[PDB]
Amino acid sequence: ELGVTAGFNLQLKDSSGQGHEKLIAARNTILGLASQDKRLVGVRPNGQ
Amino acid sequence: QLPPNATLDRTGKVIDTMTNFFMNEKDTVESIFTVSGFSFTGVGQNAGIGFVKLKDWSKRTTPETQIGSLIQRGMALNMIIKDASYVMPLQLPAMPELGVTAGFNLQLKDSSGQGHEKLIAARNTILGLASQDKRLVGVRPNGQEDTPQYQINVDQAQAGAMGVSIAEINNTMRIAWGGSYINDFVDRGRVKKVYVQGDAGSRMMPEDLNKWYVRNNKGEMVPFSAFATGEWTYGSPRLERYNGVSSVNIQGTPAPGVSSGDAMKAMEEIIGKLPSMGLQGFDYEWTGLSLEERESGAQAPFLYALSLLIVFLCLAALYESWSIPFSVLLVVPLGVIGAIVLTYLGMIIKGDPNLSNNIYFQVAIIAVIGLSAKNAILIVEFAKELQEKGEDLLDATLHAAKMRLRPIIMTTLAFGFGVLPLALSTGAGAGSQHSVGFGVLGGVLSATFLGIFFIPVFYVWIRSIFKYK
Amino acid sequence: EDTPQYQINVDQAQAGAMGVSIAEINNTMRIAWGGSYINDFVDRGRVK
Amino acid sequence: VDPDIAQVQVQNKLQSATALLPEDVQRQGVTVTKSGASFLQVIAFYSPDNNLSDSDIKDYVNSSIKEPLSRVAGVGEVQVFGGSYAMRIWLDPAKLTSYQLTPSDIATALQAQNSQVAVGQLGGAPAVQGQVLNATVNAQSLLQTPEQFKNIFLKNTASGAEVRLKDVARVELGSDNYQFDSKFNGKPAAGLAIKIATGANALDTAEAVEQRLSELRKNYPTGLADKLAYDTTPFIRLSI
Amino acid sequence: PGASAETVENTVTQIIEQQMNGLDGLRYISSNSAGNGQASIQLNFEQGVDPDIAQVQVQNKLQSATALLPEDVQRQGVTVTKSGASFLQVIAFYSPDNNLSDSDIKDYVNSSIKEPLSRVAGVGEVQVFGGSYAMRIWLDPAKL
Amino acid sequence: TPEQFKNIFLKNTASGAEVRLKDVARVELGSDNYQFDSKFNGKPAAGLAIKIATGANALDTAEAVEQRLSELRKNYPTGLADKLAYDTTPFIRLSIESVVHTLIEAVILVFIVMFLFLQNWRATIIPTLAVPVVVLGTFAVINIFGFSINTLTMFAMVLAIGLLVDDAIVVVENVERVMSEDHTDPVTATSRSMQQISGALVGITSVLTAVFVPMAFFGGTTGVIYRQFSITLVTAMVLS
Amino acid sequence: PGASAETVENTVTQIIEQQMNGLDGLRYISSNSAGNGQASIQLNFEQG
Numbered sequence A: 001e002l003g004v005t006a007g008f009n010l011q012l013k014d015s016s017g018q019g020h021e022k023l024i025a026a027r028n029t030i031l032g033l034a035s036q037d038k039r040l041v042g043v044r045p046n047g048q
Numbered sequence B: 001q002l003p004p005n006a007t008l009d010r011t012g013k014v015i016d017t018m019t020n021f022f023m024n025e026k027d028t029v030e031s032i033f034t035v036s037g038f039s040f041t042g043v044g045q046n047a048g049i050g051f052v053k054l055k056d057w058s059k060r061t062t063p064e065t066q067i068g069s070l071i072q073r074g075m076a077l078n079m080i081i082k083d084a085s086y087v088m089p090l091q092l093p094a095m096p097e098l099g100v101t102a103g104f105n106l107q108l109k110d111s112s113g114q115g116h117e118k119l120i121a122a123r124n125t126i127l128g129l130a131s132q133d134k135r136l137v138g139v140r141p142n143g144q145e146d147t148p149q150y151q152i153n154v155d156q157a158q159a160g161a162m163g164v165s166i167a168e169i170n171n172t173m174r175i176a177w178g179g180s181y182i183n184d185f186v187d188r189g190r191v192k193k194v195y196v197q198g199d200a201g202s203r204m205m206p207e208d209l210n211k212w213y214v215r216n217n218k219g220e221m222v223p224f225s226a227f228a229t230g231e232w233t234y235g236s237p238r239l240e241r242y243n244g245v246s247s248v249n250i251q252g253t254p255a256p257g258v259s260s261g262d263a264m265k266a267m268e269e270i271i272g273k274l275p276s277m278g279l280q281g282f283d284y285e286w287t288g289l290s291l292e293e294r295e296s297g298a299q300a301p302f303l304y305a306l307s308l309l310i311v312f313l314c315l316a317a318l319y320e321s322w323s324i325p326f327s328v329l330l331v332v333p334l335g336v337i338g339a340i341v342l343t344y345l346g347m348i349i350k351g352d353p354n355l356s357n358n359i360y361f362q363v364a365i366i367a368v369i370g371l372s373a374k375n376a377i378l379i380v381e382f383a384k385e386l387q388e389k390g391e392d393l394l395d396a397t398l399h400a401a402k403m404r405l406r407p408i409i410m411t412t413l414a415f416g417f418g419v420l421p422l423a424l425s426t427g428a429g430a431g432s433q434h435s436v437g438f439g440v441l442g443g444v445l446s447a448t449f450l451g452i453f454f455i456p457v458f459y460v461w462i463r464s465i466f467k468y469k
Numbered sequence C: 001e002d003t004p005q006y007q008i009n010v011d012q013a014q015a016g017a018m019g020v021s022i023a024e025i026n027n028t029m030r031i032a033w034g035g036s037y038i039n040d041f042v043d044r045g046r047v048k
Numbered sequence D: 001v002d003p004d005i006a007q008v009q010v011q012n013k014l015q016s017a018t019a020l021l022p023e024d025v026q027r028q029g030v031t032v033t034k035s036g037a038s039f040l041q042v043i044a045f046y047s048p049d050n051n052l053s054d055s056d057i058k059d060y061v062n063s064s065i066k067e068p069l070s071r072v073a074g075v076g077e078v079q080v081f082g083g084s085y086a087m088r089i090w091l092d093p094a095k096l097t098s099y100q101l102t103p104s105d106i107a108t109a110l111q112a113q114n115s116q117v118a119v120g121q122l123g124g125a126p127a128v129q130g131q132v133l134n135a136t137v138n139a140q141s142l143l144q145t146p147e148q149f150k151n152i153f154l155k156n157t158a159s160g161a162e163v164r165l166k167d168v169a170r171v172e173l174g175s176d177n178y179q180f181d182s183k184f185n186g187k188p189a190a191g192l193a194i195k196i197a198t199g200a201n202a203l204d205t206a207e208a209v210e211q212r213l214s215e216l217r218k219n220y221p222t223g224l225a226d227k228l229a230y231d232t233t234p235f236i237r238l239s240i
Numbered sequence E: 001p002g003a004s005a006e007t008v009e010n011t012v013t014q015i016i017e018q019q020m021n022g023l024d025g026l027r028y029i030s031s032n033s034a035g036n037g038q039a040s041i042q043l044n045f046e047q048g049v050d051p052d053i054a055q056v057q058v059q060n061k062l063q064s065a066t067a068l069l070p071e072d073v074q075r076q077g078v079t080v081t082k083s084g085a086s087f088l089q090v091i092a093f094y095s096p097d098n099n100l101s102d103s104d105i106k107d108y109v110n111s112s113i114k115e116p117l118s119r120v121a122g123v124g125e126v127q128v129f130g131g132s133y134a135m136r137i138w139l140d141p142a143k144l
Numbered sequence F: 001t002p003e004q005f006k007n008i009f010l011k012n013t014a015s016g017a018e019v020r021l022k023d024v025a026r027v028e029l030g031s032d033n034y035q036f037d038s039k040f041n042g043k044p045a046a047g048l049a050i051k052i053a054t055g056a057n058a059l060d061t062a063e064a065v066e067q068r069l070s071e072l073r074k075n076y077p078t079g080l081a082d083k084l085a086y087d088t089t090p091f092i093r094l095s096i097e098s099v100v101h102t103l104i105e106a107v108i109l110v111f112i113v114m115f116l117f118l119q120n121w122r123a124t125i126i127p128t129l130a131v132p133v134v135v136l137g138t139f140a141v142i143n144i145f146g147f148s149i150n151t152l153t154m155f156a157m158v159l160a161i162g163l164l165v166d167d168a169i170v171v172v173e174n175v176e177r178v179m180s181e182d183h184t185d186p187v188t189a190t191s192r193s194m195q196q197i198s199g200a201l202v203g204i205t206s207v208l209t210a211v212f213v214p215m216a217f218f219g220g221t222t223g224v225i226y227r228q229f230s231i232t233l234v235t236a237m238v239l240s
Numbered sequence G: 001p002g003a004s005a006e007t008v009e010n011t012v013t014q015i016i017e018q019q020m021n022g023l024d025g026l027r028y029i030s031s032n033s034a035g036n037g038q039a040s041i042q043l044n045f046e047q048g
């Protein structure tokens, strides 16, 4: 019943209506620091 | 509520006179939120509502800072604000789940089928009679009132000749005088709506219709005036039905010292005068909280009877007699006397409409019966044992009473001290606590000062008639 | 049980020379022989 | 399987086929019902003296008797085999050819003419400053009589003469369906069936229907009688 | 639409009202027909009746009734809701220093604060007292 | 944007001039609804009124509403504030707390009655120790059957304190007497005392459980209220 | 059919989720709109 695959799931949610290109920009900043952080392993964007 | 056909602007002027009053009642009032155009009864430009939050219960201990003191001062608004039909401040119901506002709700049903006009005539007799009863405050019709309407009649024949479709006129006049949602645009990532309607100056008055034109099949422009005409008419804005029959809802409140049942009985008497006055064929039904009030009072006689029976049968099975259960049942009136007596005196001395026969009083009476029975068993169980062991009835009954007295008083007094806190409650929920307390406490007092004496006497009487063994 | 039935056979080419359109022919018959419900009206407070 | 749950599942699935249904089928409407109680009794409303037609009585039961009987205690469902009147326009093929008209034209003239206009309100929500009155504008524009239907405009002749619906057709108030003939005892008739409600005493529901009927017979149109064509209550009374 | 309180009553109200008479556990019915064309029917059931199952029952009664409705009524849709009696809370949104406008405030409560609260556990109904921005085109009759 | 709606193309006139939307109308960003004017403290405001779903705790729903709002406030525009104009939950808590104050007060008052009669700390303590067990246990049993803590259940617990100490009182009152009469040891008296006391104990329990049992069977809203008192009372008496 | 992901989000998905309020037991709603013209809205409810 669960497709999470034991991975923390984070839903970056644009609540202020910045836009899709801005939402993507934010995601990119988040994925950089995560790769740098030793605790976090294999944090990957889910969609396309 | 404002007069019929009122504008939103006129309603907002009244809600401002109302808001100034509450905002100036500083000791008892903290806030107000108001909506013009919204009402529980209906949405119209004439309707309005206000939600007032009083100050903390701590800051409101004086009589002036009480809830009913506010409501009575705010009832002067009806006289102050001339324009509005009514401005009525209303408390919430005890259980707000079961209602919007406290008071009574009734439906006048046109059971005969006489009319809509006849029905409103009946409402208005009931309304003036209720104005003149001092057991009632704020009787009002609930619902919309008859209003002047604007009727446009379109000549189908001339429409056909000019060559304008009646279907097309509807399209031109539905978008012009009312609005039309056509499609959706995106604002900040969110779909909104696009509306087309005419400007306000074009849709304000009957003469403004003449400003609009409808295209024919030849493609020409034909004035609305050419095919239609308007007359001012009078009619009902909304029709109400209760259980398959046409009705009117009447809602009101009891006067300051009167109970809900009393106001309910006053209204039913007023409706009784309807036939004598000349409007007959009218019937009524109770609804909401009032229905329920009626139903709860009804079930009480059956409740009391069934409870008495279960005690009687259980006692027989336990004690293998028929005579002794009767002796214990006979002493029961003695406890119930104190319960009713404290409640009635208390109401008179305390001036409290809340101290009346209610659901809470009924639970108390059940408790008193159990207490009286419990007190009677202790003296009587021991008496039968001694008789079974050869003691003569009088001696055995007497011995029992001495042996069981200290136990009986001690238990009876502890049940009494337990309900003293309910009886003397000053906080939120006090009224309910008092209803239970006084009834229980009275019964305790009567049981201790009259019942104890009666328990030996009835047993001796029954046992003498039906001798043991 | 199966029963005799009748079929109309429309020639598009004879009709074409005449000018007539197929859906015009089709529409005529639907209303004529078949019947059509246009819209509602009110009689004595009941819509029929 | 719980009946109510089964019916609601079916209706919900049905909501996904409607767009794909022919306009006409959609216009009539599609219904979903469920199995259940048997009929306690069928009452036949018939005209002994042949005064009333079937169409007339089915219409009377529909507009008069159906609803009062439904409110009677214990009655879960009231069914009438039958329907009300319909306005009927019968078209002469020859009269249409004479004025160069086709059935479709008559249809187009009948959609436009018979419409309900909706306007709005005088005051209006975003109103002008200084508006004192708000009312409701309503337009009566629908047609209720046969004559209104015959005067409907169609065309103007070369002479300038007027051709209306009366010229090319016969307009009458007639039956909605002509498919069935119903009679009781050789006399025109209509039938109403009663279904008992859940958790009910049929014997008591039956008595209640009898008494309601008693009140409505007084206001009957001339020539109507009511009798029972089916009753199951005798069985149950006898069995108890 | 376009219909009087008397036509809304005989055409829609009573026809819907008769279908629901046999429903299990129905304490009473109250109905309203209005001059704007709106009809409303409230059904009260007896204690003991599950509200979820009662909702599935009314809807099952209404599928047949909708047929007998007038066509323009069916077109506008018929709504069935589980209904509550009183507001638990009324929340006010406002500007203290008037550094924000009401059209802006009203828009933010309809676009940002209403759906999440309507989706808060136990919430049920949510009514808004302000409006949202819409594109408004106001026509001049003469120029048209 | 509204400019794009002003440039909508509508028609061309004979001259060949283009007619755009601006020519026939005024375009503006306005409102979906113009029906209601809401104010807070006499000043413009918007409002959200919440009507709780059936089958839910108001208290719990309120906390959730506020918790969601706490997260929402962080993304607020600069001007926005929020206050509760109408809240009913505060009274509910104060009502719940008042009754708990009353319960504590009653227990203390009962202790004193017993002490005035018993006159020994040792005697008084035994009946008193019953109260924690009886009340805690009753709360337990009732939650097994889905009864919450409410004013009605709580009133029943207050009503029961004088009632549930009875069996205990009727036991120690006697052991104590037995001893002053026979000068026997605490254990001998207790065993003797328990033989004389048992007929009385069963009888008092029976009467007090039986008066409260018919209430639960009654239906309707009144029945819902009655069963709060009767489950609590009956559980308490058996436990005692 | 034939729609862009953007067209399915504006025209279809947002319109539907706006009506999705007032549901007993709703833990969360997750949605997707794609280039193949398809929209999927998934609603997850709490236990019981």
Ligand SMILES: CCN(CC)[C@@H]1C(O)=C(C(N)=O)C(=O)[C@@]2(O)C(O)=C3C(=O)c4c(O)cc([C@@H]5CCCN5)c(C(F)(F)F)c4C[C@H]3C[C@@H]12
Residues within 6 Å of the ligand: D042, D081, D082, D083, D177, D180, D181, D182, D190, D191, D192, D229, D230
């Ligand atoms: C509206 C046109 N039409 C109206 C004629 C009805 C309609 O077409 C529908 C549909 N499609 O829904 C049907 O229900 C129907 O076709 C049908 O099933 C019938 C029966 O079977 C039936 C029966 O079983 C027992 C009796 C009783 C039992 C006791 C004495 N006789 C009668 C009755 F005599 F009362 F009329 C009927 C009539 C028809 C109605 C049909």
